Amino acid sequence: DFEEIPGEYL
């Protein structure tokens, strides 16, 4: 249920 975070955050 958590929205994806940018790839830069690993």
Place this chain on the structure above:
Amino acid sequence: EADCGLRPLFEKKSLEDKTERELLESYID
């Protein structure tokens, strides 16, 4: 820090949040 615990959207602007008065009222001394 010298600026700790002072909120940019509240204390820094002299704005109070909706329930902080409830805390102050409980500090009876």
Place this chain on the structure above:
Amino acid sequence: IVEGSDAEIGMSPWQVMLFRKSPQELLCGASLISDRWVLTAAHCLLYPPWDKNFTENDLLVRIGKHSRTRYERNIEKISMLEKIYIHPRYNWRENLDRDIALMKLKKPVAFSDYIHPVCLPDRETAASLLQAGYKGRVTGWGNLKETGQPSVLQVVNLPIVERPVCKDSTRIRITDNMFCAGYKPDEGKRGDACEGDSGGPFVMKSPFNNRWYQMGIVSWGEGCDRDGKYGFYTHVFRLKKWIQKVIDQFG
């Protein structure tokens, strides 16, 4: 948080979310104490009864958040952990005595309207504010009920309870490194921290200098918001010598 309310925008700018990378989920609350240091409960990172033993790379620190699940573009900042420091005398076997941990961030976080550190109390702040009946504030994205999950950060104001009343509510041994808070069944009003709120701050606003101080860390309870039961918090000032030692040596 059970029986709390939605936080206002920028209400707890020191609120930190401890976020598990895989599976992507809420690990715990935490608090921002400087541009590189984050304070949490040791049980958030190490708890052998539940096979919890997180290392630096297992998680992320999300600061400036309001929404629980959403990626708050241009608002929140996501930080990596350089190093975790758990109290060497943290007692996970019995009562979570000294339930405290620090996390050093890889890079300093930039302060903003939504990101700002809370103060840590000195001996006089603690002596003047940690008094039965005085209210503090607890925040978190944890369970809305003991037995669901909030859309946004929740807040509850709770009174500190008399030590004999804390002691008489439980079979667990209470130490001087803990305090309890919450309303009594006679008081009418409700509220408590719950699963997922652990590690979050219990704060008080000094009426002397108008600054917010983190007096407690959400530590434990027996269920959530039960009558005649109270939430237990790590006593931050009692463990400040350890906090200062870790920061002086590694920061």
